[PDB]
Amino acid sequence: PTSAYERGQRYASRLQNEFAGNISALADAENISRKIITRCINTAKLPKSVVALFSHPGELSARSGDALQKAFTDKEELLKQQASNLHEQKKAGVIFEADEVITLLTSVLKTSSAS
Amino acid sequence: PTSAYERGQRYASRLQNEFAGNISALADAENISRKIITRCINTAKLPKSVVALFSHPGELSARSGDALQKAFTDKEELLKQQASNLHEQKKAGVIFEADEVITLLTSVLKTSSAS
DNA sequence: CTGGGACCATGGTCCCAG
DNA sequence: CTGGGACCATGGTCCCAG
Numbered sequence: 684p685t686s687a688y689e690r691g692q693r694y695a696s697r698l699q700n701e702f703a704g705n706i707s708a709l710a711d712a713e714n715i716s717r718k719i720i721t722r723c724i725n726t727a728k729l730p731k732s733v734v735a736l737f738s739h740p741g742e743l744s745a746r747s748g749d750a751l752q753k754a755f756t757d758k759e760e761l762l763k764q765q766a767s768n769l770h771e772q773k774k775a776g777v778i779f780e781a782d783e784v785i786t787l788l789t790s791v792l793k794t795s796s797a798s
Numbered sequence: 799p800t801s802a803y804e805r806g807q808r809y810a811s812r813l814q815n816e817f818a819g820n821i822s823a824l825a826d827a828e829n830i831s832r833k834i835i836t837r838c839i840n841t842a843k844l845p846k847s848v849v850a851l852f853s854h855p856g857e858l859s860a861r862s863g864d865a866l867q868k869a870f871t872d873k874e875e876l877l878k879q880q881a882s883n884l885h886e887q888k889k890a891g892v893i894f895e896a897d898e899v900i901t902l903l904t905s906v907l908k909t910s911s912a913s
Numbered sequence: 914c915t916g917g918g919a920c921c922a923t924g925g926t927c928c929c930a931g
Numbered sequence: 932c933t934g935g936g937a938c939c940a941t942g943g944t945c946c947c948a949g
């Protein structure tokens with residue numbers, strides 16, 4: 684099963700050109716809900732760094748990828764930072780699975796840091 | 799007492815005009831250690847928004863303004879973004895207070911902290 | 914057209930209790 | 932050990948409202 688990130692790349696191009704950016708058009712073409720295209724496409728927007736955090740790109744579900752991207756909209760730099768920070772954890776040997784990555788990543792946006 | 803940020807602005811001007819980039823010159827003028835000028839100036843270099851995180855600009859110490867500035871040098875976007883974040887949180891009713899603010903901003907750079 | 918909300922069955926994990 | 936209940940996130944679909 685190709686990764687959400689991957690699908691998103693394809694969906695992305697097919698939109699810009701093959702369908703004049705008509706999500707609905709592409710959807711029918713791919714014979715799949717529009718949301719699915721949205722979710723994956725937004726995932727493909729995530730920084731290459733953030734993708735790397737996962738062993739296998741398939742570990743980043745379209746659903747979480749989508750939410751991640753929306754969450755860090757207009758804050759790509761913050762995202763990139765967090766991403767690197769986590770990269771050092773594993774660099775220093777630390778290990779956390781998929782489900783955690785998104786959490787730790789998103790953490791910076793949550794107040795539970797101090798409260 | 800005029801806040802560091804304020805002093806910073808005034809200093810930087812005289813520095814750019816009345817004394818053509820010569821800290822020592824300005825220092826002699828204001829009759830205060832060069833360090834002070836440096837601290838305030840860097841403080842005035844902080845994004846309006848970052849200053850805005852505090853009720854009164856006076857809440858931002860020259861000392862912190864300085865460290866904050868140096869800390870995020872060549873990372874102004876990151877700072878602005880992280881400032882937004884903290885702005886949205888207190889927008890959602892969260893409450894911070896001076897000391898906590900500067901610490902929160904800086905947390906982003908810390909591998910241990912952010913993750 | 915488009916995004917978002919309400920839903921859905923599924924593969925799958927945990928863990929309790931015979 | 933073994934089955935079953937309680938959950939869970941996911942991929943998806945529908946369909947409403949801007």
